Design an enzyme around this catalytic site. Structure first.
Site, PDB file in Angstrom:
ATOM      1  N   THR A 129       0.811  -1.246   0.000  1.00 20.99           N
ATOM      2  CA  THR A 129       0.000   0.000   0.000  1.00 20.99           C
ATOM      3  C   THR A 129       0.819   1.259   0.000  1.00 20.99           C
ATOM      4  O   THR A 129       1.837   1.353   0.684  1.00 20.99           O
ATOM      5  CB  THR A 129      -0.901   0.085   1.231  1.00 20.99           C
ATOM      6  OG1 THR A 129      -1.908  -0.913   1.128  1.00 20.99           O
ATOM      7  CG2 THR A 129      -1.566   1.452   1.328  1.00 20.99           C
TER       8      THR A 129
ATOM      9  N   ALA B 132      -7.218  -3.360   6.138  1.00 23.73           N
ATOM     10  CA  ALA B 132      -8.362  -2.885   5.374  1.00 23.73           C
ATOM     11  C   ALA B 132      -9.595  -2.744   6.250  1.00 23.73           C
ATOM     12  O   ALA B 132     -10.151  -1.653   6.396  1.00 23.73           O
ATOM     13  CB  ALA B 132      -8.647  -3.826   4.238  1.00 23.73           C
TER      14      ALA B 132
HETATM   15  C1  LIG Z   1      -2.161  -1.677   2.433  1.00 23.50           C
HETATM   16  C2  LIG Z   1      -0.925  -2.644   2.656  1.00 23.50           C
HETATM   17  C3  LIG Z   1      -0.289  -2.467   4.045  1.00 23.50           C
HETATM   18  O1  LIG Z   1      -0.195  -1.312   4.450  1.00 23.50           O
HETATM   19  N1  LIG Z   1       0.176  -3.492   4.871  1.00 23.50           N
HETATM   20  C4  LIG Z   1       0.177  -4.956   4.631  1.00 23.50           C
HETATM   21  C5  LIG Z   1      -0.961  -5.720   5.410  1.00 23.50           C
HETATM   22  C6  LIG Z   1      -2.227  -5.695   4.602  1.00 23.50           C
HETATM   23  C7  LIG Z   1      -3.497  -5.462   5.025  1.00 23.50           C
HETATM   24  C8  LIG Z   1      -4.679  -5.400   4.007  1.00 23.50           C
HETATM   25  N2  LIG Z   1      -5.245  -6.709   3.712  1.00 23.50           N
HETATM   26  C9  LIG Z   1      -5.943  -7.322   4.672  1.00 23.50           C
HETATM   27  O2  LIG Z   1      -6.130  -6.799   5.764  1.00 23.50           O
HETATM   28  C10 LIG Z   1      -6.567  -8.688   4.408  1.00 23.50           C
HETATM   29  N3  LIG Z   1      -7.296  -9.098   5.627  1.00 23.50           N
HETATM   30  C11 LIG Z   1      -6.644  -9.494   6.761  1.00 23.50           C
HETATM   31  O3  LIG Z   1      -5.400  -9.517   6.811  1.00 23.50           O
HETATM   32  N4  LIG Z   1      -7.407  -9.857   7.820  1.00 23.50           N
HETATM   33  C12 LIG Z   1      -6.836 -10.319   9.093  1.00 23.50           C
HETATM   34  C13 LIG Z   1      -6.735 -11.845   8.952  1.00 23.50           C
HETATM   35  O4  LIG Z   1      -5.723 -12.400   9.635  1.00 23.50           O
HETATM   36  O5  LIG Z   1      -7.499 -12.506   8.242  1.00 23.50           O
HETATM   37  C14 LIG Z   1      -7.684  -9.806  10.300  1.00 23.50           C
HETATM   38  C15 LIG Z   1      -7.662  -8.250  10.320  1.00 23.50           C
HETATM   39  C16 LIG Z   1      -7.123 -10.312  11.656  1.00 23.50           C
HETATM   40  C17 LIG Z   1      -7.568  -8.673   3.191  1.00 23.50           C
HETATM   41  C18 LIG Z   1      -8.742  -7.678   3.430  1.00 23.50           C
HETATM   42  C19 LIG Z   1      -6.899  -8.305   1.851  1.00 23.50           C
HETATM   43  C20 LIG Z   1      -4.046  -4.723   2.812  1.00 23.50           C
HETATM   44  O6  LIG Z   1      -4.018  -5.275   1.717  1.00 23.50           O
HETATM   45  N5  LIG Z   1      -3.564  -3.480   3.081  1.00 23.50           N
HETATM   46  C21 LIG Z   1      -3.463  -2.443   2.088  1.00 23.50           C
HETATM   47  C22 LIG Z   1      -4.733  -1.505   1.936  1.00 23.50           C
HETATM   48  C23 LIG Z   1      -5.068  -0.694   3.233  1.00 23.50           C
HETATM   49  C24 LIG Z   1      -6.004  -2.326   1.546  1.00 23.50           C
END
Ligand SMILES: */C1=C\C(=O)NCC/C=C/[C@H](NC(=O)[C@@H](NC(=O)N[C@H](C(=O)O)C(C)C)C(C)C)C(=O)N[C@H]1C(C)C
EC number: 3.4.25.1
Lengths: 242, 204, 250, 244, 212, 198, 241, 233
Positions: free
Chosen positions: E1, E49
């Site tokens: 991100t 997210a």
């Molecule tokens: C921005 C990237 C980052 O800043 N950092 C990397 C971590 C990414 C987080 C986000 N994707 C997710 O959160 C995914 N869901 C998730 O991880 N859920 C946890 C789980 O263990 O299942 C829960 C919260 C405990 C999924 C929604 C893709 C991501 O891609 N970050 C991006 C931007 C903010 C979308």
């Protein structure tokens, strides 16, 4: 004395009934609904010339598509409005959509009977019923323009037109005849403004009376003095015309 | 790690002929870093003295607590609290925090105004009362202090002598402790008067 | 259920009186006489054991109670109220003092505690004041001997000598005459027995009278030996026998 | 249920008065008189012991003058029991302030607190108010010597000279007559004893019926001193002032 | 991100990528990392997210209530503190969010607040948040001037996200642009990196590294 | 850590606080003011855990301001610091303690003297001629231990800081982006806008 | 525990405890507030039922909620304290959360709510207080003046008075205050206020305190002299006729 | 007399009556008439809706509690909402936890016990509404009559509200006939409309004035209003 939730021998709740009385003493408020929008009008009623009349708020916004007028002990309505706004905003947060006007009303009415010194049903904490009625007006995609009358009893009705407050019984009598299913927003404004003039002790001007409406296109707006004053005039002329 | 070893410092009390003495260092450091050389660890309420080694924040806190309690005690009892009584108050106050104690090593010294008898007592962090008739040691250099006292000490010393003895016990003990020193102060207490002296010692 | 009586049962009348307290005091007046006398080396408290049936065993019921080993109490008014008051008093001496300082509370302070308990029953919700007045007599190292009176209002005062109950007016007068700041305990005990006599109708012996004193320390009554500073309780209840032997030189 | 026996101690009269507060005051009006006189170099507290006797021990007795702080004291008029409850919470409040700021509590701050506690029993709780009126005499480095007064209502005010309890009207008039801004402590001490002497319901104003206290800045020091007179000290001052 | 927001002579520029990753797995390339609080308020998302998306929506609700209550739009400073204080309530529980609250009010002018789940709240002119932040900062820092045509600033922002999408394995998908003036925010499209990269490469002559 | 320095000269207290705010790999801001005015003559600088830092400062501020309005008076610096210590002391045994260290510089309009208070997150309070939180101490404490006098002027004091700040830019591993200086005296609190070359 | 409904409706739709609360107000000393074109002034009378007090320490009638807003009242003193405290607390809270001091309207709305709340909560009686709150919103020069009462109702006034004989002084103000042209001067505004109080205070320069609030937290209370002077210049105006 | 024993529900009159409950019971008689009847295949509810003005609406009288259960009210509208909501939860709970449709007989017992709680404990007030419950469960079609006193009864048919005695006599007369209208809803509904009309007086039942609901064998509880009920007038 006697419990705040005691029944009369006629099957009524004393406090609620008395509550209704305080409301009869309230400043007039009228609501008229037309296929072009709903109009809400209220009697300011300043108790002195030194009282800055525009600091009199008896018509407030619940949400962009819902507004409401009050009559009776107006201080009692603050928490009702808060609840109503919170309910409206909240429904949007949980469902990604606007709150239906009727549901919003039903919500407000649910607080109504939440009074007592320990009524066996939950935890009704509020020492007495509210001493104010409300005319909730708005619009939603499901049932278009709507006007609701909500009382401290917890009940509510839908009206094409409704007048509550000091001159109600008389003004309602007029509305009964004046209202017809083809009224226009314009017509409704003058009608409200007119009936308000007949029941108000004061000479209705743009300072002791306030108008507002709710339309699908622009939502809930409160007519500013200049706008209302010109409607006042527009009324005098039409009346003096016959 | 050990809370009682963050700030450092020592206190020591001794009984002499119709007198009691209590001394302390002035160091207040943060681990190896020396921070203040004006941190006295001796306090008093009326004619009862209280020295406190350990974690500085608690040393301060306890003093403020005992002032509060001794003040109310005087207002209600209409007399100043005695050494023996205060010792009990100190003990119960600490044990009240049995499972989350203040990290301090309290020492009480004074003369019973009614009996004129000298009194000194030490306590562990949860109130265990140690009422000795000769001396009480506390602080990060307590081992050294025990060594000093057990040898230097002898019964019924006159104020002027007790002062030499207590000062030498404190001074030499602190010089073997990296966390103690940076100045000392000594109180000589008699029925009538109380004298306070600042000792000249190494500043390393 | 649940006590819905969270409001005061004792309030101010237009005249400024607190009825329930007044009435409580009235109940005290109707009570059996009890008195107290402070000597230069002791204090004495006594009352009459008004056995309410010849079949009852008056010994199984004490009106004179030990609160701490140097403090005793006696009353006039409602016996049951006094009883629970004594339990509370004995407990408070511990929980609010001995457990903090490792020593029993001095008379004025324990009295102060009892007083508070009574004050509260005068303002708390859902209760009535206590229908009794107490006479606490004790001794502490820094205050010597003392005698106190505690009323249903929660008020208390120190006395050289005084009486409460039925013949208090009369008894008080008889005491104002006989008292002086040079009385020795034995003298007070005597004055005591004389004062009590007037207030007693029929039988007057070591079985119908109850009297205890706060005086010297009683090592013999300690129960153990080996601790120098522990010399024994100052409170001692006279025996039926001890009372009669005195009535003979009355 | 219970409602039947609820006196409703916290309600307005049709006139907008608080029944109980009024009645509590009514009770206070029958209490031994207490007077507070503030001078330029000190404050004076004097109170008349209601109900006394040959046998009443006086060296041990206290019923109107209580030390709250080292620089603050109060004179009581009303229910002693009620007063003690408040007095103790007050002593605690002062110590807390001290613990929090390492500074002696400013006199008005202590008074406002006590007054607030009272005020509460006036607006909620269904309990009766404290039948007490206090005359506060204290000193601090922000307003020097101060004299305050609080009653069952929970309201407080400052004074140069004031009385509480019985015959206050009479007492007030006499003080209003001879009080002068430039008074000195001993001046105040006399005015105090004189007023009582004139309002007393008793035959003579003897020491055994008085409690006396003064907060003077013992010149030979530079600090303020609180002194509650003992039986003999009151007996002496009583002779000098000319009441023997 | 990668998310960035910066103030300049013509208001505020906000640019974000649109890639969502679950570890090294690319979950989505079409995520909206910009929350439209209202006509004058925008929020960016970085970190978890769910956390951002949920709480920022919640923020919108809180802002709307404020306006109904006080009859006036909430200040950027206040909107950011609602989020800041909420997030602080959960400190230590595991929330993960690097956020930017940007807006324009008559009283504050262009304003940008950085708010993360740490409880950190900062006002500033430039902020780059996310795993690609350093990359965006590289491009942005060395081409930023207070005097940039609303059109040049827009491109600098877009180009900075492009840099990040290229170098950062967790950034990519497309670029979403916004311009903020006192009249409110103006959306300036979604630019897929799939076409944007080659275009920029060819036209600018940069990325000269990559083989074309 | 962050640089939090304080030095009490003759008639004032001077507080210097690093301007950098770094998060992991990137320095996010170079103009951060790690300070809060508690009252017209009392200033508090702080350093510590990301969230607690400001939350605690603003909390203390709110209270001191409330006390001022209620009493229409300004608590002495000593009193203000005692309040702060009590707050941190409570915190240390709470469920989640404030990880904040502070310096309190104030001018006691009554005693008419400047005062400097050092207090860590444990509630440890000490009054000093000069103090510092974090690593800064390890460098400055001996600089000042050397070049320090009780009667120094505000000007001399500011020069003494310049001396300290230089040593810190020379030996400290991090780039704290310079400091923001502030002076508390009989006339209140003001900032030395020109120290980035003074 | 205690939750008895003390404020309830009676047959005619009245809530006596609230009304009786107003009666307490009517009995309180007089309070008045008039807003000029660039300032607001608050005046209060001082009872004389007893006179030998110490005005230094006796709590005054005009209280500061924050640096730019003040509140005066008529009614029970003990009650007013509780309201003033809550207000001062809310003031600091609002600054802390919104990073901006309260507007006079907001502060007023808060206090009004507290009053309203005490009219429909079990176990409590309404505040025997009515207030006048005035000041200038942060970074605004338009003077603000509001009034609240036991019921919880509030509104703004060009000028208003509460307390005993308020009926009188209101009259004076209704035929002495021209909205068209408000007291363009702090001086002429403070004069009008003293004049209105003189209708009821019956000569008492020591029984009349004034407080002038100007934009940007500029609040100051006048001394007996400053006040006594207005009393003088005004009594002549009369005689000169 | 009575005046000394009707201040609350925690007081018995010298004759063993509970006036507060009786007064509550009165609120029902003052309410608009509603009827209920059932065959072996279906259960029907017919209610007369009442309005305020002619500019107002007609207050709803029928509420659905689940796909197989519903009711009609007479009295305090709010209370009916409270009680029906409670009945919705109980129906819901029975499904979620036991995957079982709440038997009408059981729903009745629950309502009874819930009502009873506000007649023996200080502070509470009885409910001021009567309810007619119909439902189709594992034992067929059912009709219940609920009173604020807590008395719940199973009947073939009944009516509550003003002038209700009219319809009740009619049903008590028609019994043998309608109880056999199996496999023919439109007939049971007509019998229901004929029953309710026996309680008319003021006017006659119109389209936005009549309300009917039905539940049965293969018929999920459904309400009919307006033109939907036109075919029955
Ligand atoms: C921005 C990237 C980052 O800043 N950092 C990397 C971590 C990414 C987080 C986000 N994707 C997710 O959160 C995914 N869901 C998730 O991880 N859920 C946890 C789980 O263990 O299942 C829960 C919260 C405990 C999924 C929604 C893709 C991501 O891609 N970050 C991006 C931007 C903010 C979308």
């Amino acid at each position: 004395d006697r419990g705040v939730s005691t029944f009369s021998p006629e099957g009524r709740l004393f406090q609620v009934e008395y509550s209704l009385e305080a409301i009869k003493l309230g400043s007039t408020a009228i609501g008229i609904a037309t296929k072009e929008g709903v109009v809400l009008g209220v009697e300011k009623r300043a108790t002195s010339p030194l009282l800055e009349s525009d600091s009199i708020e008896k018509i407030v916004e619940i949400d962009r598509h819902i507004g409401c007028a009050m009559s009776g002990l107006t201080a009692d309505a603050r928490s009702m409005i808060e609840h109503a706004r919170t309910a409206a905003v909240t429904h949007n947060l949980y469902y990604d959509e606007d709150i239906n006007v009727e549901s919003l009303t039903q919500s407000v009415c649910d607080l109504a009977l939440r009074f007592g010194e320990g009524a066996s049903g939950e935890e009704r904490l509020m020492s007495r019923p509210f001493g104010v009625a409300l005319l909730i007006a708005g619009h939603d995609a499901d049932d278009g323009y709507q006007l609701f009358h909500a009382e401290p009893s917890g009940t509510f009705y839908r009206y094409n037109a409704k007048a509550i407050g000091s001159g109600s019984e008389g003004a309602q009598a007029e509305l009964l005849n004046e209202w017809h299913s083809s009224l226009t927003l314009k017509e409704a404004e003058l009608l409200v403004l007119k009936i308000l003039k007949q029941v108000m002790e004061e000479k209705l001007d743009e300072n002791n009376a306030q108008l507002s409406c709710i339309t699908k296109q622009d939502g809930f707006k409160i007519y500013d003095n200049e706008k209302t004053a010109e409607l006042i005039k527009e009324l005098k002329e039409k009346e003096a015309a016959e | 790690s050990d809370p009682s070893s963050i700030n450092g410092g020592i206190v020591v009390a001794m009984t002499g002929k119709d007198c009691v003495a209590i001394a302390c260092d002035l160091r207040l450091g943060s681990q190896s870093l020396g921070v203040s050389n004006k941190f006295e660890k001796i306090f008093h309420y009326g004619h009862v003295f209280l020295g406190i080694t350990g974690l500085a924040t608690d040393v301060t806190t306890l003093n403020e607590m005992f002032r509060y309690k001794t003040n109310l005690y005087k207002l209600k009892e209409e007399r100043a609290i005695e050494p023996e009584t205060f010792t009990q108050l100190v003990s119960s106050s600490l044990y009240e925090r049995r499972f989350g104690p203040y990290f301090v090593g309290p020492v009480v010294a004074g003369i019973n105004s009614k009996s004129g008898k000298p009194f000194i007592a030490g306590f562990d962090l949860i109130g265990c009362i140690d009422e000795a008739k000769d001396f009480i040691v506390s602080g990060t250099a307590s081992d050294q202090l025990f060594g000093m006292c057990e040898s230097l000490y002898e019964p019924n010393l006159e104020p002027e002598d007790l002062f030499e003895t207590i000062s030498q016990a404190l001074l030499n003990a602190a010089d073997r402790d990296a966390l103690s020193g940076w100045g000392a102060v000594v109180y000589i207490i008699k029925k009538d008067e109380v004298v306070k002296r600042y000792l000249k010692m190494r500043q390393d | 259920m649940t006590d819905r009586y969270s409001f005061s049962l004792t309030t101010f009348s237009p005249s400024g009186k607190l009825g329930q307290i007044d009435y409580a005091l009235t109940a005290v007046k109707q009570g059996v006489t009890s008195l107290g006398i402070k000597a230069t080396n002791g204090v004495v408290i006594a009352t009459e054991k008004k056995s309410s049936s010849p079949l009852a065993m008056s010994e199984t019921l004490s009106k004179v109670s030990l609160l701490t080993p140097d403090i005793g109490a006696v009353y006039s008014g409602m016996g049951p109220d006094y009883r629970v008051l004594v339990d509370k008093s004995r407990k408070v001496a511990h929980t609010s003092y001995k457990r903090i300082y490792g020593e029993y509370p001095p008379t004025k302070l324990l009295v102060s505690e009892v007083a508070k308990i009574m004050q509260e029953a005068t303002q708390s919700g859902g209760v009535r004041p206590f229908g009794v007045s107490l006479l606490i007599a004790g001794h502490d190292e820094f205050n010597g001997f003392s005698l106190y009176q505690v009323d249903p209002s929660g008020s208390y005062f120190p006395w050289k000598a005084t009486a409460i109950g039925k013949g208090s007016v009369a008894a008080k007068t008889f005491l104002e005459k006989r008292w002086n700041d040079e009385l020795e305990l034995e003298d007070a005990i005597h004055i005591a027995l004389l004062t009590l006599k007037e207030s007693v109708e029929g039988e007057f012996n070591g079985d119908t009278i109850e009297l205890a004193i706060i005086g010297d320390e009683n090592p013999d009554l300690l129960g153990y030996t080996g601790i120098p500073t522990d010399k024994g309780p100052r409170f001692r209840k006279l025996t039926s026998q001890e009372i009669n032997d005195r009535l003979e030189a009355l | 249920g219970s409602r039947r026996y609820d006196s409703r101690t916290t309600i307005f009269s049709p006139e907008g008065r608080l029944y109980q507060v009024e009645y509590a005051l009514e009770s206070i009006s029958h209490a031994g008189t207490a007077i507070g006189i503030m001078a330029s170099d000190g404050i004076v507290l004097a109170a008349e012991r209601k109900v006394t006797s040959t046998l009443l021990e006086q060296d041990t007795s206290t019923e109107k003058l209580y030390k709250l702080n080292d620089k603050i004291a109060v004179a009581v008029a009303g229910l002693t029991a009620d007063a003690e409850i408040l007095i103790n919470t007050a002593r605690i409040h002062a110590q807390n302030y001290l613990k929090t700021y390492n500074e002696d509590i400013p006199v008005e701050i202590l008074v406002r607190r006590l007054s607030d506690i009272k005020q509460g029993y006036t607006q909620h709780g269904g309990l009766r108010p404290f039948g007490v009126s206090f005359i506060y005499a204290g000193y601090d480095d922000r307003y020097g010597y101060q004299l305050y007064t609080s009653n069952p209502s929970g309201n407080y005010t400052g004074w140069k000279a004031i009385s509480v309890g019985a015959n206050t009207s009479a007492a007030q008039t006499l003080l209003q007559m001879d009080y002068k801004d430039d008074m000195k402590v001993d001046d105040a001490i006399e005015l105090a004893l004189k007023t009582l002497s004139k309002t007393t319901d008793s035959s003579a104003l003897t020491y055994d019926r008085l409690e006396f206290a003064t907060i003077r800045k013992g010149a030979n020091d530079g600090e303020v001193y609180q002194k509650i007179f003992k039986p003999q000290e009151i007996k002496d001052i009583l002779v000098k002032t000319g009441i023997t | 991100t990668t998310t960035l927001a910066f103030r300049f002579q013509g208001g505020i520029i906000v640019a974000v990528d649109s890639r969502a990753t679950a570890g090294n797995w690319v979950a989505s390339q079409t995520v909206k990392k910009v929350i439209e609080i209202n006509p004058f308020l925008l929020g960016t998302m970085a970190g978890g997210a769910a956390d951002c998306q949920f709480w920022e929506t919640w923020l919108g609700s809180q802002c709307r209530l404020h306006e109904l209550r006080e009859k006036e739009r909430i200040s950027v400073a206040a909107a950011s503190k609602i989020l800041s204080n909420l997030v602080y309530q959960y400190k230590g529980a595991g929330l993960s969010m690097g956020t930017m609250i940007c807006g324009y009010t008559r009283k504050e002018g262009p304003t940008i607040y950085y708010v993360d789940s740490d409880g950190t709240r900062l006002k500033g002119d430039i902020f780059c948040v996310g795993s690609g932040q350093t990359f965006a900062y590289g491009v942005l820092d060395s081409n930023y001037k207070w005097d940039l045509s609303v059109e040049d600033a827009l491109y600098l922002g877009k180009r900075s996200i492009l840099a990040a999408a290229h170098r950062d394995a967790y950034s990519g998908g497309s670029v979403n642009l916004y311009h903020v003036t006192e009249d409110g925010w103006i959306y300036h499209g979604n630019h897929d990196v799939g076409e944007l990269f080659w275009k920029v490469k060819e036209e600018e002559g940069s990325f000269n590294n990559v083989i074309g | 850590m962050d640089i939090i320095l304080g030095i009490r000269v003759q008639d004032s207290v001077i507080l210097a606080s690093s301007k950098a705010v770094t998060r992991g790999i990137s320095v996010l801001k170079d103009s951060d003011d790690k300070t809060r005015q508690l009252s017209p003559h009392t200033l508090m600088s702080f350093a510590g855990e990301a969230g607690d830092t400001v939350q605690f400062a603003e909390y203390i501020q709110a209270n001191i301001q409330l006390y001022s309005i209620r009493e229409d008076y300004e608590l002495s610096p000593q009193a203000v610091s005692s309040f702060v210590r009590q707050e941190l002391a409570k915190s240390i045994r709470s469920r989640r303690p404030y990880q904040v260290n502070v310096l309190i510089g104030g001018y006691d309009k009554k005693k008419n003297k400047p005062e400097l208070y050092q207090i860590d997150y444990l509630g440890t309070k000490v009054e000093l001629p000069y103090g510092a939180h974090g690593y800064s101490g390890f460098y400055t404490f001996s600089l000042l231990d050397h070049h320090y006098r009780p009667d120094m002027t505000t000007e001399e004091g500011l020069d003494l800081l310049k001396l300290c700040v230089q040593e810190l830019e020379k030996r400290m591993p991090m780039d704290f982006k310079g400091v923001i200086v502030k002076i508390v005296d009989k006339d209140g609190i003001r900032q030395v806008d020109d120290f980035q070359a003074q | 525990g205690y939750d008895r409904a003390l404020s309830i409706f009676s047959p005619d739709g009245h809530i006596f405890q609230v009304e009786y609360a107003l009666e307490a107000v009517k009995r309180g000393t007089c309070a008045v507030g008039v807003k000029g074109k660039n300032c607001v002034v608050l005046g209060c009378e001082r009872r004389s039922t007893l006179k030998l007090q110490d005005t230094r320490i006796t709590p005054s009638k005009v209280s500061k909620i924050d640096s730019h807003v003040v509140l005066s009242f008529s009614g029970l003193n003990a009650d007013s304290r509780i309201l003033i405290e809550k207000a001062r607390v809310e003031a600091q809270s609002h600054r802390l959360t919104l990073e901006d001091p309260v507007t006079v309207e907001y502060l007023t709305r808060y206090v009004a709510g507290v009053q309203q709340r005490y009219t429909q909560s079990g176990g409590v009686r309404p505040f025997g207080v009515s207030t006048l709150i005035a000041g200038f919103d942060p970074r605004d020069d338009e003077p603000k003046l509001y009034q609240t009462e036991p019921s919880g109702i509030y509104s703004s006034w060009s000028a208003q008075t509460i307390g005993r004989n308020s009926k009188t002084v209101r009259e004076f103000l209704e035929k002495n205050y021209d909205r068209k042209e408000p007291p363009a001067t702090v001086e002429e505004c403070v004069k009008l206020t003293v004049r209105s109080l003189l209708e009821v205070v019956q000569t008492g320069a020591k029984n009349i305190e004034i407080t002038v609030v100007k934009p940007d937290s500029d609040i100051v209370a006048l001394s007996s002299e400053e006040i006594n002077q207005y009393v003088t210049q005004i009594e002549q105006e009369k005689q000169e006729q | 007399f009575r005046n000394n024993y009707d201040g609350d529900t925690v007081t018995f009159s010298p004759t063993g009556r509970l006036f507060q409950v009786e007064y509550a019971l009165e609120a029902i008689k003052q309410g608009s008439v509603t009827v209920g009847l059932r065959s072996n295949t279906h259960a029907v509810l017919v209610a007369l809706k009442r309005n305020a003005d002619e500019l107002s609406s007609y207050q709803k009288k029928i509420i659905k509690c689940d796909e197989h259960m519903g009711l009609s009210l007479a009295g305090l509208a709010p209370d009916a909402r409270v009680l029906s909501n409670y009945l919705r939860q109980q129906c819901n709970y029975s499904s979620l936890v036991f995957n079982r449709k709440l038997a009408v007989e059981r729903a009745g017992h629950l309502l009874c016990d819930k009502a009873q709680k506000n007649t023996q404990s200080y502070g509470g007030r009885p409910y001021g509404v009567g309810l007619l419950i119909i439902g189709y469960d594992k034992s067929g079609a059912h009709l219940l009559e609920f009173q604020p006193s807590g008395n719940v009864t199973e009947l073939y048919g009944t009516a509550i509200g003003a002038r209700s005695q009219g319809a009740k006599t009619y049903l008590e007369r028609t019994l043998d006939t309608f109880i056999k209208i199996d496999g023919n809803p439109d007939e049971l509904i007509k019998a229901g409309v004929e029953a309710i009309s026996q309680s008319l007086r003021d006017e006659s039942l119109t389209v936005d004035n009549l309300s009917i609901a039905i539940v049965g064998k293969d018929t999920p509880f459904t309400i009919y209003d307006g033109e939907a009920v036109a075919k029955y007038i």
